[PDB]
Amino acid sequence: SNTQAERSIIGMIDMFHKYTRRDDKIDKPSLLTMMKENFPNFLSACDKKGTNYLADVFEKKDKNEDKKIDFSEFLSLLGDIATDYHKQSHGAAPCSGGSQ
Template structure:
């Protein structure tokens, strides 16, 4: 059975996460910022959010202060960005 488009999209998101993580399976703040700027520039809208938007969002997810987040928190961060984009474009 072939994967649906939605399944392919989610699998690509997993691959994208791993492209920017270290061997510890965590994404660092800088890696997240680079990944978002390279792959989701239209979702960031810095003119509306300010230059520290992603950094501040990352800080709220980095509860333990390790300066890295796991896949679950990565999805939560991405979900926040997408939700804000949806709200702004609706």
């Protein structure tokens, strides 16, 4: 059996895998679809403030400029999303970016 936290991690691995091609990496179209399918309420909050999160997410997160998102780069993206929810849990508005 798995705890909720274990299940969550396991599910994140599945989510990554779902959007990969045979090279175990995610291309730009698939990353954007992953975001719309899995983080629609996050994206709606960005839209509410006039921000298109999807305009530059791929290029910001493709750290090595190889036109693919690997697992490490995917984890950085999940960390950015989690950070936003963490800030909300201390009273911030959603989609606050905030790279000061």
